[PDB]
Amino acid sequence: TGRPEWIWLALGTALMGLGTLYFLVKGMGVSDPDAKKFYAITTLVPAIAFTMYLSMLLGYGLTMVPFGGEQNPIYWARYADWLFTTPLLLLDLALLVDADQGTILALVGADGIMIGTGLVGALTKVYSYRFVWWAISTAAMLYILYVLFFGFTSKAESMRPEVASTFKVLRNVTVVLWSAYPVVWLIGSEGAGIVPLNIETLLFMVLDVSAKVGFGLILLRSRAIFGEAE
């Protein structure tokens, strides 16, 4: 409670934990193999986020990085979370549209580059270089978003209508929410430092819960997750 952002870390921990438990209960008894994949991916996402939020709350997921002549508090645990949860979210989208394996690898690999370069930027001691890493990570994000909109055209003709509808919604949620992350980083403690760490933490908490629990609620309520069966 000594760090003013503790309240948002505590709320994030609680919301990710509750979301995990809800998805776990909802997925009980699901037998359809396709739906099992979606439940597994979508429950793992907030479970991982729960552990990383808790690590930030307890202080383990925080380090001090010297730059700008100050000791800057950097929550590195965010990147450990996103390293696993962001490819999983992309996998949900890719499986919906029956994406080719090559497209899945492109997405997951670009996503790993996005998170890894974000982490390097977050830990870099030379202030100006932090924004070089931010730019590379943002380029990887833009590549991901491009694929989401322009890499699935060969699947549109044979796509079930409910699949197309649910994918379209989830893709729009993804573009809007994922785009905000580089902005928050750029203006917050890890970038220009014009927004204080406590407000940055609040912003990431709202984004994370929306991108994980909100996204999951939309997906797991849809008929698109079930194979076409009589």
Ligand X SMILES: CCCCCCCCCCCCCCCCCCCC
Ligand Y SMILES: CCCCCCCC/C=C\CCCCCCCC(=O)OC[C@H](O)CO
User: Considering only residues 54, 89, 93, 213, which one is a binding residue for ligand Y as defined by CB under 6 A?
Assistant: 213
For the chain, the farthest-separated pair of C-alpha atoms sits apart, in whole angstroms, at 66
* Spatial distance between the Cα atoms of 200 and 194, rounded to a whole number of angstroms: 10
Residue 135 binds ligand X, judged by CB under 6 A: yes
Residue 51 beta carbon to ligand OLA: minimum distance, rounded to whole angstroms: 32
To the nearest 10°, report the CA torsion of 81, 84, 89, 90.
130
Reduced to 3 states, what is the DSSP secondary structure of residue 65? strand
State phi, psi for 97 to the nearest 5 degrees. Answer: -95, 5
* Spatial distance between the Cα atoms of 79 and 98, rounded to a whole number of angstroms: 28
Choice between 55 and 72, CB closer to ligand OLA: 72
**C-beta separation of 92 from 41 below 8 A:** yes
- According to DSSP, residue 224 is labeled G
What does the per-residue mask of binding to ligand X show for 83-122, with x meaning CB under 6 A? xx--xx--x----------------x---x----------
Residue 66 binds ligand Y, judged by CB under 6 A: no
Residue 183 binds ligand OLA, judged by CB under 6 A: no
Residue 139 contact partner, candidates ligand Y, ligand X, ligand OLA, none, CB within 5 to 8 A by sort of partner? ligand Y
Assigned token pair, 72: 């800057």
Choice between 156 and 192, CB closer to ligand OLA: 192
Residue 199 binds ligand X, judged by CB under 6 A: no
Instruction: Report angle CA 173, 18, 37 to the nearest 5 degrees.
Output: 60
User: Considering only residues 6, 22, 127, 131, which one is a binding residue for ligand Y as defined by CB under 6 A?
Assistant: 22
* Spatial distance between the Cα atoms of 112 and 44, rounded to a whole number of angstroms: 18
Residue 140 beta carbon to ligand Y: minimum distance, rounded to whole angstroms: 4
* Binding-site ranges for ligand Y (CB under 6 A): 15, 18-19, 22, 26, 63, 80, 102-103, 106, 109-110, 113, 136, 139-140, 143, 151, 209-210, 213-214, 217
